[PDB]
Amino acid sequence: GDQRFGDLVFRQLAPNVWQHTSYLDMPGFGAVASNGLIVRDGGRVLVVDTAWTDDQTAQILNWIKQEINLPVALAVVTHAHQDKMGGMDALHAAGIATYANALSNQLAPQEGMVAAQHSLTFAANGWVEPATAPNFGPLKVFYPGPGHTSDNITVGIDGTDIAFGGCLIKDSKAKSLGNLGDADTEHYAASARAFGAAFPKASMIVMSHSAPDSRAAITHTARMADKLR
Ligand SMILES: COC(=O)[C@H](CS)NC(=O)OCc1ccccc1
Ligand SMILES: [Zn+2]
Ligand SMILES: [Zn+2]
């Protein structure tokens, strides 16, 4: 079940995988949840996405200390919006190595974000260039194409049935795609489908603004995105 820890929520998804959830009271939109991931890989911990704020992200690290008690080797953040990168300074203060799409790091200052320390680059087929993602262990990083944003990336967890779509994917009962302010409306559907095709064995889809779902999250998201064209 859910574990309330301060103002955040943690949920175990698999033996070595937990979802972190944090909230930002956005005026005119209510208190918006955003999810990321925590993965134990042997004697270290890997984080996918910050919380909305530095303080919340420090709380993620506090939860990790109390519930796992192993060092956080790295974090990867999945685009340059506040829900994914708002807590970068907290990661740096903690001495954690940070990674983002090169384009996310380029965009970070104008989006009001602090850039990650390291830039990921991607092959033409979307897979991360391995040299730019050293020591990522089971994290398999994939750029599906522009969709939710131009820079959005996705992460599969090798050895599990989990893939993380970030803010690209919404669940199978969602009425909308969420924040389309920086979206590529022409390419969104194809990018959602490319995410699915990159992680064909993933039966649990995790995403930023819905609870974990089946692969129907991918098909429904793509079908909704068809309407943008
Ligand atoms: C500061 O906002 C954010 O970081 C995220 C980035 S994806 N935006 C968000 O969650 O917007 C909430 C929203 C806005 C319009 C329509 C649906 C949801
Ligand atoms: Zn976003
Ligand atoms: Zn988001």
Tell me the DSSP string of the chain.
--EEETTEEEEEEETTEEEEEEEEEETTTEEEEEEEEEEEETTEEEEES--SSHHHHHHHHHHHHHHT-S-EEEEEE-SSSHHHHTTHHHHHHTT-EEEEEHHHHHHHHHHTPPPPSEEE-B-TTSBBPGGGSTT-TTEEEE---SSSSTT--EEEETTSSEEE-GGG---TT-SS-S--TT--TTTHHHHHHHHHHHSTT--EEE-SSS--B-THHHHHHHHHHHTT-
Cα 44 to averaged position of ligand 1 atoms, centre (Å)? 31
Our measurement of the distance from residue 112's CA atom to the centroid of its chain's CA atoms, rounded to an integer in Å, reads 18
Closest Cα to residue 156, out of 57, 22, 37, 42?
A: 37
Q: According to the entry, how was the structure determined?
A: X-ray
Strand arrangement, sheet containing 154-157 = 139-142, 154-157, 162-164, 204-206
* Dihedral sign for Cα atoms in the order 143, 145, 146, 148: negative
Q: Of 117, 129, 120, 172, nearest to 151 (Cα)?
A: 120
Q: Are 214 and 203 in contact (CB under 8 A)?
A: yes
Q: What are phi and psi of 202, to 5 degrees?
A: -75, 120
Whose C-alpha lies nearest to ligand 1, atom 13? 179
- Sheet arrangement for strand 118-120: 3-5, 8-14, 17-26, 30-41, 44-48, 72-77, 97-101, 118-120
12 lines ligand 1 (CB under 6 A): no
Q: Distance between CA atoms of 96 and 13, rounded to whole angstroms? A: 23
Q: Is 16 annotated as a binding residue?
A: no
Q: Kindly give the pairing relationship between strand 154-157 and strand 8-14.
A: unpaired
Chain centroid, CA 63 distance in Å? 18
Contact of 148 with 183, CB cutoff 8 Å: yes
Q: Determine the residue of 57, 83, 167 to mutate for testing ligand 1's pocket, defined as the one with the most ligand atoms within 8 A of the Cβ atom.
A: 83
Instruction: Compute the distance between CA of residue 1 and CA of residue 147 in angstroms, rounded to an integer.
Output: 32
- Tokens describing residue 48: 């996918």
Amino acid in the structure at residue 211 = A
In whole angstroms, how far apart are CA 107 and each of 85, 112, 129, 151, 182?
11, 9, 20, 9, 12
What size, in residues, is the chain?
A: 229
Cβ neighbors of 164 (< 8 A, separation 6 or more) are 36, 37, 48, 78, 154, 155, 156, 157, 205, 206, 207
Residue type, 184: D
CATH of the domain at 18: 3.60.15.10
- The dihedrals phi and psi of 84, each to the nearest 5 degrees, come to -105, -25
- How many beta carbons lie within 10 A of that of residue 111, not counting itself? 18
Query: Domain containing 150: what range?
Result: 1-229
| C-alpha–C-alpha distance, residues 79 and 120, integer Å | 12
Instruction: Measure the CA–CA gap between 128 and 124, rounded to whole angstroms.
Output: 9
Q: Which atom of ligand 1 is nearest to the CA of 84?
A: 4
**Pick from 60, 51, 115: nearest CA to 87:** 51
**How many structural domains is the chain composed of?**
1
